[PDB]
Symmetry: C2
Subunit: 362 residues, 2 copies
Amino acid sequence: SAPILQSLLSCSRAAATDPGLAAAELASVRAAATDAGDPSERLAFYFADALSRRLACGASDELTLCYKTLNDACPYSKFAHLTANQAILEATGAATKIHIVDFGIVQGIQWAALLQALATRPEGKPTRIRITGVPSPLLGPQPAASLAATNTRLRDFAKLLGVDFEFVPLLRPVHELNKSDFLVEPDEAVAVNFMLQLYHLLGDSDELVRRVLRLAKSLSPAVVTLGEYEVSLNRAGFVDRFANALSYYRSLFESLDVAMTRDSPERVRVERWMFGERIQRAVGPEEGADRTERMAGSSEWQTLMEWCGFEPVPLSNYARSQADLLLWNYDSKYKYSLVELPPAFLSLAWEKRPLLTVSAWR
Amino acid sequence: SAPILQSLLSCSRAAATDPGLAAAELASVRAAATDAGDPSERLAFYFADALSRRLACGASDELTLCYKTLNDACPYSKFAHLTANQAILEATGAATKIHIVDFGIVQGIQWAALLQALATRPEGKPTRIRITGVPSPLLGPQPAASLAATNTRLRDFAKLLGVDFEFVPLLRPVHELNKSDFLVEPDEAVAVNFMLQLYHLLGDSDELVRRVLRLAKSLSPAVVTLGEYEVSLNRAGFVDRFANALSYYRSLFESLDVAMTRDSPERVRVERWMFGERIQRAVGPEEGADRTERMAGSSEWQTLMEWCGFEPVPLSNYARSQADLLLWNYDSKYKYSLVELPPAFLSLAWEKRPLLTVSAWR
């Protein structure tokens, strides 16, 4: 472990104690840190900033560009989508009519991939596919242009498969939606998809994540797919959260380093506006009900899903191969691998540290 | 059309006439050209160089790196592989044992993709898949380390699918191989794959391309897939070849420009060692039997395939959708589209100009 990061960790520990943290210690880390240097230097830059802000207190455009950059450089979103899609395909094989509910849609590519897969599945192409999409916070407060374009794009794609298809959005806040808003029909199989979405609802209270998991369960889904960041940033106390976050973001920062140049502006946008802001939320001033954008590890998610009446579904026999296929062209300098977490999670890891975990439930 | 390119074209025309080309004209193009400027400037640089060499006469490492760069920046190889694989999957559905013959294998990714697809096909997973691979010239005169590693990688992948699998290489020159060398068995379906390979055999004479197409036919394949550069650089005379090549490479150079930075060293490697060398071969000094690395348009390929007793096979109903899916994340600055060429070719185009064409035959 790099000295700048060990010094940062001792800073967080000192900060949480009675004597407190000396300015010289934090100043030394801040001096050594750089948002333009190597991954450990950049990482310390954003963490030392957040720690400063914590001590001092006592956009939509950025994010959408960031999301696109991250997914061109890294296999995270593709891993998650394809692994979720394989679980949906297998769960819904006996159905001729399928209804997908996407809590937190960004662009349409997961569903374009799924449509292609459904068209060629063993049981034969479905006679109807409907998608109901709740826009991801990544699309901002003004998601209409983006959703309409995704709708058009998916409907044009479905025409090229010869399949009856519909897409509709739900724009009201999820906390106001009810079962009847999803317009589910008795003759269709439902799959519910939560990809990098549900962590937004974690809070001092579980009520919002409970309300939407109950809502999902009420649709009697054939399967519910969950894709989540693998880091425990919820109820743990500050010193543990700081350590958990530092290790997690160290892996993310390193995977950016192998993928993009040291001077890439796109890279800095991701590091500052996506990762840096998340770091501020996890390790910055805010606490209790004020602390937002929490994340949880896979055991905590399992506890919540089972609490809401779901049970684990094993992933496909062909989920590890599909994920290896996706990683095939990442040469030797990349450090991606797949890690199983119990009971039925599959996670994409960097240097054997799980970063993005996918699971299926019913 | 850019003035530097129109000036280049008039240069080629002057060169082929009796008066000849004036040094001032070619010097003006050479002055304006730059291997570090915009696509039309880089293009003129390599073409003006080749034209100079023509007038004056009266590696494996480079290429392998180039191939990797090109395929990380552009969808050409993925388009070709996935479209070929879909045709193989459909042709071999009724078979429980499949034997793939790959003339010109580079790395294993086409077959890893096909194995994944076969494992999930409607008819149920095959009981045995064998692959016989002839190494691509891109692997150089020393392909053993690369082939062995590909073999290992594909066999490890097949274990994760639960399918009986074998891979073997053929290292002798293709002009010495015979039907018995492929060890085909009466109970298996054979697919033969030529992806960016057969153009290497085109020559003043057709004998080498004839010999290998007859060899393929003798294996009684369920399907033969062909993927080729869409540019007529074979029997056409110099002024036509120069014009054809200039238009073709203009599209390739432009697609690199949207994908990579102007100062990328990787980009220059591709432009100089892959494209620049090909340009030298097409438009440089060599003629008649000395002219090598010819390329042909889709009509010429159809003539040759039919001459060798093959007939066109329609591509999948889901080949256009699969190709749209592959292109989904190329944003608006990219100019890729799909173009049908008769009778049954599918081509990936840049600004509506076909660049890489795939077809199936039997």
